[PDB]
């Protein structure tokens, strides 16, 4: 187990915010939602030193204020914008549903809203091949950061980024029509990622399919690719991360070795954290942890939302994984054969024999962990059975 | 003055070889009376040097103090090293000596001498030559010997000065000190100067040199990355104290300069006195130039990376036509906040990154390597090394499910015990999709026995078959790139012709015909018989010899009414005023294409 917490202050800043410009106003308020998801879901109300119970409600007040605050950027037709006069942006629309979906857990949303907002993207902004398009009035945004990309490479980023929103908030409006939309889109990402264009593209793409069918042939192919680009310090690895680069793209400059990587490796971390391959994940969060020092800070809120959801998911993957089992072996008809309570302290409780010829039933109620049952059976057969022999012998 | 941004630089640019009292004596002398100054210098180069770029060898005293540095930033203790060791180090430079002297004349005296700037500078140039340089010399000019000023000092221009300041770097101090004006050196020897010159090669000083930040030096200590970045930050804050922006302005467009803890005022020409308040009636001006206030304190880090700093043009805000101060009122740099950690204040050290694939190296450990999943499956549980007796669980890819013993066990052997395991399962997934087609129905997974229907737009149909079915884990079988929808004859042109140049001209019999159309039957007026012929080839030959070659009868040539009829058909051809030509060469005058 590794420690991944937050400074008492850090949170303080995030919750307090800075104020003035409408610009990055939204950017102003997104973090609170994450600092709540992480603070509630991984229970950590306790950090404060004051009264945790009312402090929880203090954030809630800020959280609902902030909830309508985002609505400001919602249009007529339910599509998110920066300015109503402004323009409707396919980018922000996805990014809203992504923020909302995580929040819906503990702050109930306007259901009918979420839906029409969804149906906007799907019915209007999806090609015949699943891929999504940014609407127009194209605007570089300070918040967006590393998102800008070249050639089709941007179709991929966006399709995957909008997939993420739709995955995140699908629960709230499970529509037969938008599940289909997900099917078509997912296929794009699988069937159109493989010859990898960027590390940043590989990663979100990986992460987006990571929120879908995580057993898929093509997908695990992709995940392998990403998993092979990784950087390490110390072997066996103590530290692991990803840098954004391709073999064509070298200059004697500081900028290429540029933060973009924190975002890309954050998408990797989030990908694997879904696969629940903690072995892979450990050197990353140690390093991402270690990152603040090496990194200085996370340049823009975009990655900082993903880093936080990382630390969140991990601290609650640990929790799922701990062994508190209560296994029971019994004969279906004849009596109760023994049964053993298995924990961290007393794992691999025993081996026991099977006495009687009654179907065997191994079975825990609700419990937390991972246990392995082996049923090695021992039998004797004559020589001249087809099973073993193929010839007629004598001597 | 380019303190700036990143700060490496060249020493041809400062031209202030000014010591503690080198500059201070001049400023303090300048308060005594309206003064002008005459500089004379002579470089004496000895050698160059290039400090090698990497793997530099640092000193004990330095490496020492460079260590007793705390991990956590502390402007207090960090600043310390700049005071003691410095800021930059020489990548390259020269070593030797400089004859460098600054002469102080009361501007009243110069006006009394009446010499032009070019004259005055030259009288010092040639007088030095005669008096100190020892050379059998350029002929003097009585312009420099018998003017109203030199006349009052035994014909010397130099001895006219209130005093001189020595900026001589190099050689033995005995010989150097003598070259500065003193009554003791006042009957001194030219002999002195040549002796000094030899001394300079045995006792040089660094002149004419390039620099680079002392920080780039600290690269391989315990906590390099930590202390090196801790120091760039500390470098910024250290810079601010040294700036003279904080000095209050000087009475008369005087530019205040800092040394140590004090601002002494630098005076404009025609002003003197302790703070440039006094002026002889020669100064005939009250224009004031603007100079910045000091910078602001940074604004707290923002909604964006962004942060703010500010000055205003008010220290000596401009008046009655003084120069507007030049630079930035404002400054955006981007910034950050610290969020994750409590414990460490960590130490990273100049490690070396590596793509993971390239290091595959140790087996002493004796755990088993990653094993081989079976076809259509994967290992649930990735590592490089597994301890002996560990299990790894095999599961199957989508649409396939485990049949049997799901585990391999790591043997002390190094070998794997390998299970009774297979990935049988029948659930076809959505096939290798070509952008062109569209399958129906559209699902994530298909059941054993469901069929899909490949369909395309109107003008087109499918290259391979249209209906695949899901049997024994395969279909029956999809092209995987061998299938899309392209229409025959890829302003449409008539059946005899093809398009080639955005203008409808005939397809050539020999060339374009090749793809197997139906065996047609055709009558030929030149032959007076018929022949069975491919269709493509026929519709070409219409162009050339149509009036010779008619359309007759679909299928290979064969007897019946069909044949006797097509014969009549094109025997009655002459009188027919109207022949239609849809798929047939023609429709009779009497018929309609149907
Ligand atoms: C503006 O003032 C500040 C404080 O002295 C410095 O950071 C900068 O060099 C400039 O002089
Ligand atoms: C502010 O800084 C500028 C140079 O950056 C000067 O022009 C001015 O005198 C003041 O020092």
């Amino acid at each position: 187990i590794l420690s991944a917490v937050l400074s008492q202050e850090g949170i303080n800043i995030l919750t307090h915010l800075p104020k003035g410009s409408a610009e990055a106003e939204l950017m102003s308020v997104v973090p609170v939602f994450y600092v709540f998801h992480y603070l509630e879901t991984g229970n950590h109300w306790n950090i404060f030193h004051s009264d945790p119970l009312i402090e929880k409600q203090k954030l809630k007040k800020k959280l609902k204020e902030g909830m309508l605050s985002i609505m400001s950027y919602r249009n007529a037709d339910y599509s998110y914008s920066v300015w109503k006069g402004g323009s409707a942006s396919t980018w922000l629309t996805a990014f809203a549903l992504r923020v909302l979906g995580q929040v819906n857990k503990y702050v109930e949303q306007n259901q009918n809203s979420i839906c029409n907002s969804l149906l906007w993207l799907v019915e209007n902004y999806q090609l015949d091949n699943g891929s999504f398009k940014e609407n127009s009035q194209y605007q570089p945004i300070k918040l967006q950061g590393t998102l800008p990309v070249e050639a089709r490479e941007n179709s991929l980023y966006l399709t995957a980024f909008t997939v993420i929103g739709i995955r995140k908030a699908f629960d709230i409006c499970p529509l037969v029509k938008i599940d289909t939309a997900l099917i078509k889109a997912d296929n794009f990402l699988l069937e159109n990622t493989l010859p990898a264009q960027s590390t940043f593209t590989l990663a979100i793409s990986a992460y987006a399919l990571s929120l879908g069918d995580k057993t898929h042939p093509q997908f695990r192919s992709i995940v392998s690719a990403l998993k092979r680009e990784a950087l390490v310090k110390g072997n066996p690895p103590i530290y692991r991360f990803w840098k954004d680069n391709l073999q064509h793209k070298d200059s004697s400059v500081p900028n290429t070795g540029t933060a973009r990587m924190v975002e890309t490796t954050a998408y990797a971390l989030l990908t694997s954290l879904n696969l629940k391959d903690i072995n892979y994940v450990n050197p990353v969060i140690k390093w991402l942890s270690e990152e603040q020092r090496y990194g200085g800070g996370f340049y823009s809120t975009q990655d900082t939302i993903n880093a936080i959801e990382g630390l969140t998911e991990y601290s609650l993957l640990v929790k799922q994984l701990r062994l508190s089992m209560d296994i029971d072996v019994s004969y279906k008809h004849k009596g109760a054969l023994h049964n053993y309570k298995m924990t961290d302290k007393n794992f691999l409780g025993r081996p026991v024999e099977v006495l009687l010829n009654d179907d065997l039933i191994v079975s825990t109620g609700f419990g937390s962990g991972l246990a392995t049952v082996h049923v090695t059976t021992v039998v004797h057969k004559t020589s001249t059975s087809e099973e073993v022999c193929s010839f007629y012998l004598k001597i | 003055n380019q303190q700036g941004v990143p700060i490496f630089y060249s020493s041809k640019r400062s031209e202030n070889i000014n010591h503690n009292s080198a500059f201070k004596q001049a400023i303090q002398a300048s308060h005594k009376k309206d003064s002008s100054f005459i500089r004379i210098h002579k470089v004496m180069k000895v050698l160059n040097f290039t400090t090698k770029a990497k793997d530099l060898h640092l000193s004990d005293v330095f490496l020492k103090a460079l260590n007793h540095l705390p991990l956590e930033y502390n402007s207090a203790l960090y600043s310390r090293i700049f005071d003691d060791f410095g800021t930059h180090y020489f990548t390259s430079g020269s070593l030797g000596g400089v004859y460098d002297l600054l002469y102080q004349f009361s501007s009243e005296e110069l006006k009394n001498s009446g010499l032009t700037e070019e004259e005055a500078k030259h009288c010092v140039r040639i007088e030095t030559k005669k008096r100190v340089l020892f050379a059998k010399k350029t002929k003097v000019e009585h312009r420099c010997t018998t003017n109203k000023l030199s006349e009052k000092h035994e014909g010397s221009f130099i001895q006219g000065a209130e005093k001189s300041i020595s900026l001589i770097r190099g050689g033995r101090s005995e010989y150097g000190a003598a070259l500065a004006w003193e009554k003791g050196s006042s009957g001194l020897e030219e002999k002195t100067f040549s002796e000094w010159l030899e001394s300079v090669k045995e006792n040089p000083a660094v002149i004419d040199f390039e620099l680079a930040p002392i920080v780039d030096l600290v690269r391989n200590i315990p906590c390099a990355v930590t202390k090196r970045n801790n120091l760039r930050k500390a470098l910024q804050e250290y810079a601010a104290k040294f700036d003279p922006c904080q000095c209050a302005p000087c009475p008369n467009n005087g530019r205040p300069t800092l040394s140590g803890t004090e601002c002494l005022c630098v005076c404009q020409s025609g002003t003197y006195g302790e703070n440039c308040e006094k002026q002889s009636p020669d100064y005939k001006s009250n224009a004031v130039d603007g100079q910045w206030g000091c910078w602001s304190s940074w604004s707290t880090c923002d909604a964006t990376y962004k942060r703010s700093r500010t000055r205003e043009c008010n220290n000596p805000a401009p008046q009655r036509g003084g120069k507007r101060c030049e630079g930035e009122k404002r400054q955006e740099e981007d910034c950050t906040f610290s969020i994750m950690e409590n414990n460490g204040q960590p130490c990273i050290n100049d490690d070396e990154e590596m793509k993971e694939v390239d290091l595959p190296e140790i087996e002493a450990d004796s755990g088993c390597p990653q094993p081989v999943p079976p076809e259509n499956g994967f290992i649930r549980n990735e590592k490089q090394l597994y301890l002996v007796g560990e299990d790894v669980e095999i599961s199957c890819l989508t649409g396939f499910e485990t049949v049997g013993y799901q585990y391999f066990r790591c043997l002390p052997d190094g070998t794997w015990r390998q299970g009774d395991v297979e990935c049988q399962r029948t659930e076809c997934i959505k096939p290798v999709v070509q952008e062109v087609l569209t399958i129906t129905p559209f699902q994530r997974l298909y059941r054993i026995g469901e069929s899909i229907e490949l369909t395309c737009p109107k003008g087109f149909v499918v290259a391979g078959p249209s209906r695949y079915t899901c049997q024994g884990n395969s279909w029956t079988p999809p092209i995987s790139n061998s299938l899309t929808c392209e229409k025959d004859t890829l302003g449409h042109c008539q059946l005899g012709q093809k398009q080639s140049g955005s203008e409808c001209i005939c397809m050539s019999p020999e060339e374009d015909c090749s793809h197997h159309s139906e065996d047609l039957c055709v009558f030929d007026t030149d032959s007076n018989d018929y022949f069975t012929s491919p269709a493509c080839k026929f519709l070409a030959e219409k162009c050339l010899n149509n009036q010779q070659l008619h359309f007759l009868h679909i299928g290979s040539c064969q007897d019946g009414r069909q044949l006797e009829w097509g014969l009549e058909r094109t025997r009655l051809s002459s009188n027919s005023t109207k022949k239609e030509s849809c798929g047939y060469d023609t429709c009779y005058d009497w018929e309609k294409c149907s």
Side-chain angles (χ1 to χ4, degrees):
Chain A
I1 301 173
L2 337 188
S3 56
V5 160
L6 293 54
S7 143
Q8 261 188 169
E9 293 61 19
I11 296 181
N12 286 337
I13 78 164
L14 287 62
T15 65
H16 300 297
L17 302 42
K19 85 64 197 175
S21 311
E23 291 215 28
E25 182 180 7
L26 176 299
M27 187 94 144
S28 304
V29 26
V30 98
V32 189
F33 300 113
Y34 285 100
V35 157
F36 206 110
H37 184 236
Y38 163 78
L39 271 183
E40 194 178 346
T41 315
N43 46 17
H44 296 162
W45 294 123
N46 46 24
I47 294 162
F48 283 103
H49 292 97
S50 75
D51 179 8
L53 207 83
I54 280 302
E55 212 76 29
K56 165 194 292 155
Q57 198 81 212
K58 280 181 69 182
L59 294 181
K60 272 205 138 188
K61 170 196 179 295
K62 290 187 142 167
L63 210 62
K64 207 217 174 196
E65 285 186 50
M67 198 77 259
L68 292 153
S69 191
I70 151 279
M71 225 80 84
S72 300
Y73 313 96
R74 165 167 89 193
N75 290 352
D77 43 5
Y78 281 99
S79 64
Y80 301 91
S81 60
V82 59
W83 286 132
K84 262 294 305 299
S87 56
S89 60
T90 310
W91 185 81
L92 198 123
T93 321
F95 185 76
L97 296 145
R98 161 82 189 283
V99 165
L100 273 276
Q102 294 294 122
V103 191
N104 192 307
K105 263 208 55 149
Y106 40 81
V107 158
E108 183 127 48
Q109 294 312 317
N110 192 120
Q111 201 213 74
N112 194 214
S113 162
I114 308 281
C115 294
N116 303 319
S117 291
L118 275 157
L119 285 147
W120 185 78
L121 292 94
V122 39
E123 289 188 60
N124 309 123
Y125 294 91
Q126 186 180 39
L127 243 144
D128 294 320
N129 68 163
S131 57
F132 284 64
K133 60 204 82 164
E134 172 63 309
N135 179 0
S136 60
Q137 180 62 179
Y138 294 97
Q139 191 184 164
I141 297 174
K142 308 299 149 216
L143 293 50
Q144 301 181 0
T146 61
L147 149 192
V149 146
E150 284 161 19
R152 303 88 21 174
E153 193 185 321
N154 213 206
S155 198
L156 236 154
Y157 167 94
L158 187 71
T159 294
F161 185 87
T162 162
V163 151
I164 294 165
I166 305 163
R167 284 289 180 189
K168 288 274 191 169
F170 185 92
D171 293 55
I172 317 161
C173 197
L175 229 316
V176 268
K177 195 182 167 170
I178 73 173
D179 184 71
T180 299
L182 278 182
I183 293 173
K184 337 259 273 186
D186 263 0
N187 271 284
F188 184 77
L189 298 152
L190 304 167
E191 295 181 320
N192 283 277
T193 306
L194 257 192
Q197 293 300 146
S198 90
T199 294
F200 185 97
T201 312
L202 201 45
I204 292 204
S205 201
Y207 177 74
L209 307 172
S210 141
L211 291 166
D213 170 20
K214 27 227 299 194
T215 64
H216 191 102
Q218 190 66 324
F219 170 56
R220 295 203 129 252
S221 184
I222 294 178
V223 187
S224 205
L226 171 62
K227 213 126 98 163
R228 191 180 42 84
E229 296 298 317
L231 303 214
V232 287
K233 282 182 203 210
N235 57 226
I238 298 157
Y239 283 123
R240 193 195 322 279
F241 54 109
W242 285 257
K243 228 151 178 165
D244 165 54
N245 57 190
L246 301 48
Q247 280 219 14
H248 91 78
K249 177 185 160 152
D250 321 345
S251 303
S252 295
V253 195
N255 182 325
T256 285
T258 178
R260 263 201 281 250
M261 81 191 77
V262 164
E263 292 179 355
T264 76
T265 138
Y267 285 107
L269 168 53
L270 283 177
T271 282
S272 287
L273 270 185
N274 282 337
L275 293 205
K276 313 209 182 308
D277 179 16
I278 307 153
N279 268 295
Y280 198 53
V281 153
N282 278 325
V284 163
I285 83 82
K286 202 238 166 183
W287 168 109
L288 181 68
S289 173
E290 293 299 322
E291 176 280 335
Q292 128 169 321
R293 251 310 318 172
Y294 132 113
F298 300 89
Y299 290 94
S300 60
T301 277
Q302 190 177 172
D303 57 61
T304 186
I305 174 209
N306 296 312
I308 292 296
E309 192 198 303
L311 278 70
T312 326
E313 207 91 88
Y314 178 96
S315 64
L316 313 167
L317 170 288
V318 171
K319 287 175 194 168
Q320 292 177 331
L321 173 298
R322 183 205 204 256
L323 182 39
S324 181
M325 210 80 179
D326 228 4
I327 319 151
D328 171 280
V329 78
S330 206
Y331 297 110
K332 167 143 71 159
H333 320 288
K334 310 277 201 222
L337 198 41
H338 95 118
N339 59 278
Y340 34 121
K341 183 176 173 57
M342 191 165 266
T343 53
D344 284 50
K345 346 275 169 152
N346 290 163
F347 71 94
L348 182 23
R350 248 160 125 193
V352 171
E353 191 149 20
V354 183
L355 304 46
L356 297 12
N357 58 352
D358 179 1
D359 298 3
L360 208 53
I361 314 187
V362 196
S363 41
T364 179
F366 170 140
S368 90
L370 262 187
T372 77
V373 175
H374 302 38
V375 179
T376 56
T377 90
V378 164
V379 64
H380 296 67
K381 20 181 75 136
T382 63
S383 269
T384 342
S385 284
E386 267 80 337
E387 180 99 3
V388 166
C389 183
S390 299
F391 325 75
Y392 284 131
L393 263 54
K394 58 179 204 200
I395 180 179
Chain B
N1 300 358
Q2 183 192 323
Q3 306 182 356
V5 316
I7 191 176
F8 106 50
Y9 69 85
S10 193
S11 94
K12 292 150 202 160
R13 303 178 181 223
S14 68
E15 305 175 318
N16 64 167
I17 290 175
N18 287 15
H19 296 270
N20 183 193
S21 43
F23 200 32
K24 193 193 170 173
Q25 275 176 213
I27 297 168
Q28 166 201 105
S30 84
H31 301 339
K32 305 296 151 231
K33 67 230 291 177
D34 182 26
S35 285
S36 292
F37 288 74
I38 292 176
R39 188 168 193 180
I40 175 169
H41 57 90
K42 176 163 173 55
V43 73
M44 310 276 190
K45 224 183 270 223
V46 181
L47 67 318
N48 19 2
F49 70 86
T50 299
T51 294
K52 135 193 183 280
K54 306 287 182 184
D55 294 293
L56 288 178
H57 224 271
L58 321 189
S59 90
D60 278 339
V61 61
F62 180 62
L63 224 20
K64 194 165 181 149
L66 194 65
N67 259 323
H68 195 242
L69 292 205
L71 257 32
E72 193 133 29
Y73 178 95
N74 184 53
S75 197
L77 271 164
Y78 268 29
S79 294
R80 269 284 302 191
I81 79 151
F82 296 123
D83 295 292
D84 301 299
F85 287 110
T87 315
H88 294 67
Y89 73 90
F90 317 103
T91 52
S92 56
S94 305
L95 201 48
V98 177
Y99 189 74
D100 205 354
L101 288 147
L102 208 68
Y103 282 109
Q104 183 215 354
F105 296 92
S106 97
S107 300
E108 316 292 290
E109 285 285 23
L110 290 181
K111 291 163 204 168
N112 180 62
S113 96
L115 279 55
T116 190
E117 270 184 44
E118 279 323 311
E119 284 172 322
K121 261 156 68 170
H122 194 241
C123 296
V124 192
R125 196 199 182 280
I126 64 179
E127 194 190 344
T128 302
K129 193 141 224 151
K130 187 179 169 96
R131 178 149 225 139
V132 185
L133 283 206
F134 63 89
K136 314 180 215 154
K137 61 300 151 191
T138 164
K139 311 216 162 209
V140 322
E141 285 134 59
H142 278 156
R143 188 51 194 144
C144 295
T145 289
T146 61
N147 62 86
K148 277 208 189 78
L149 174 46
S150 290
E151 212 170 355
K152 295 176 302 170
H153 295 272
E154 329 298 280
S156 169
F157 192 64
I158 289 167
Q159 301 181 38
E162 308 290 327
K163 77 182 224 185
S164 85
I165 308 139
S166 166
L167 312 177
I168 296 169
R169 294 193 186 268
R172 308 266 304 182
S173 49
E174 305 92 55
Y175 306 117
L179 309 167
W181 150 27
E182 298 164 354
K183 286 187 185 187
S185 62
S186 226
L188 169 291
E189 328 291 353
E190 293 162 337
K191 197 165 179 282
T192 302
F193 176 77
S194 198
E195 280 157 18
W196 174 80
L197 189 31
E198 311 300 325
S199 158
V200 181
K201 304 156 199 173
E202 289 193 61
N203 290 260
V206 203
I207 62 200
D208 200 18
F209 58 75
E210 296 243 354
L211 296 55
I214 199 178
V215 82
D216 296 354
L217 282 180
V218 57
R219 291 190 187 164
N220 276 331
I221 61 146
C223 293
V225 187
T226 320
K227 296 174 208 177
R228 160 210 289 141
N229 266 295
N230 260 313
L231 206 45
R232 274 191 208 79
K233 176 184 265 212
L235 182 281
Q236 306 289 248
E237 292 176 26
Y238 175 79
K241 178 172 179 187
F242 297 94
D243 177 2
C245 66
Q246 59 214 38
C247 297
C250 298
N252 281 307
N253 243 28
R255 285 157 89 152
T257 195
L258 192 78
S259 90
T261 50
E262 76 168 342
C263 313
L264 290 202
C265 277
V266 179
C267 301
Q268 292 293 344
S269 178
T271 62
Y272 57 115
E274 287 312 297
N275 320 102
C276 320
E277 74 286 355
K278 321 198 178 194
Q279 60 211 57
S280 49
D282 302 40
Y283 182 83
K284 292 160 174 149
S285 178
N286 274 56
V288 47
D289 291 334
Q291 306 208 292
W292 300 113
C294 288
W295 278 102
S296 193
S297 266
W298 292 107
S299 83
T300 183
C301 206
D302 264 12
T304 319
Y305 357 73
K306 297 297 187 174
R307 185 156 71 168
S308 193
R309 198 162 60 148
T310 36
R311 353 139 136 170
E312 273 214 307
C313 202
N314 50 143
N315 181 358
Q319 292 173 96
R320 290 165 224 146
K323 279 145 206 144
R324 66 150 59 210
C325 74
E326 310 129 335
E328 342 255 7
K329 319 211 183 222
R330 186 220 173 82
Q331 213 156 54
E332 267 178 18
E333 75 172 13
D334 33 12
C335 60
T336 162
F337 33 124
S338 167
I339 34 173
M340 286 193 74
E341 192 65 19
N342 296 145
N343 180 49
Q345 191 42 50
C347 174
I348 194 138
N349 31 27
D350 287 346
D351 210 336
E352 269 259 323
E353 334 166 307
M354 311 150 289
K355 287 189 312 157
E356 161 133 333
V357 225
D358 324 46
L359 306 171
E361 280 142 2
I362 333 172
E363 161 167 331
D365 334 351
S366 319
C368 317
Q370 204 180 124
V372 210
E375 209 168 57
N376 273 312
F378 68 102
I379 70 158
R380 268 198 194 297
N381 210 207
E382 277 81 355
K383 297 181 190 192
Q384 303 290 346
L385 179 98
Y386 305 88
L387 315 151
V388 166
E390 191 176 354
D391 301 334
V392 281
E393 178 172 55
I394 270 75
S395 284
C396 295
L397 279 185
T398 206
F400 298 81
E401 64 157 13
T402 36
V403 163
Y405 207 102
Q406 13 164 135
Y407 307 102
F408 302 166
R409 171 165 291 106
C410 186
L411 311 180
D413 214 347
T415 281
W416 286 99
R417 177 182 317 290
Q418 279 191 54
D420 208 12
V421 59
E422 297 188 359
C423 287
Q424 284 164 359
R425 186 179 176 179
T426 57
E427 316 184 341
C428 306
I429 64 144
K430 204 253 294 189
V432 199
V433 141
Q434 279 226 41
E435 167 71 321
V436 181
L437 329 97
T438 32
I439 28 225
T440 313
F442 197 98
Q443 287 168 218
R444 184 89 63 129
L445 306 321
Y446 298 87
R447 207 89 252 118
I448 266 214
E450 300 191 353
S451 299
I452 36 165
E453 295 283 4
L454 281 56
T455 76
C456 280
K458 49 267 171 292
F460 317 80
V461 136
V462 286
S466 62
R467 175 171 178 243
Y468 303 87
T469 298
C470 178
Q471 266 164 128
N473 107 317
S474 40
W475 301 93
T476 52
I479 67 305
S480 176
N481 308 32
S482 200
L483 157 60
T484 279
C485 312
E486 59 230 308
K487 160 57 191 171
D488 169 38
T489 188
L490 269 163
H492 246 89
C493 313
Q494 281 135 17
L495 279 75
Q497 315 152 198
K498 69 162 177 169
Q499 197 153 311
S500 58
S502 198
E503 46 197 311
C504 295
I505 301 199
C506 291
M507 53 209 305
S508 194
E510 295 281 297
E511 302 192 324
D512 296 293
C513 293
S514 42
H515 307 314
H516 288 285
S517 302
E518 303 106 26
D519 280 354
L520 301 185
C521 192
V522 296
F523 202 98
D524 168 10
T525 312
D526 251 316
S527 205
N528 218 13
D529 213 29
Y530 37 113
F531 43 59
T532 296
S533 149
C536 189
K537 292 190 197 166
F538 175 81
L539 264 159
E541 287 190 323
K542 183 187 68 45
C543 294
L544 288 72
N545 332 214
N546 149 258
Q547 298 74 234
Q548 312 162 25
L549 269 69
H550 296 84
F551 191 111
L552 235 250
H553 152 61
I554 59 155
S556 64
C557 298
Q558 187 74 229
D559 283 342
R561 281 183 227 159
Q562 287 280 38
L563 183 295
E564 265 198 352
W565 189 238
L567 197 82
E568 184 73 5
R569 159 150 220 159
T570 56
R571 208 131 38 81
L572 201 293
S573 182
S574 303
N575 293 184
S576 168
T577 62
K578 289 171 158 196
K579 277 187 161 173
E580 298 292 4
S581 57
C582 47
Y584 208 91
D585 182 359
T586 130
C587 286
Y588 302 147
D589 206 315
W590 43 105
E591 302 182 311
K592 305 180 154 193
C593 194
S594 310

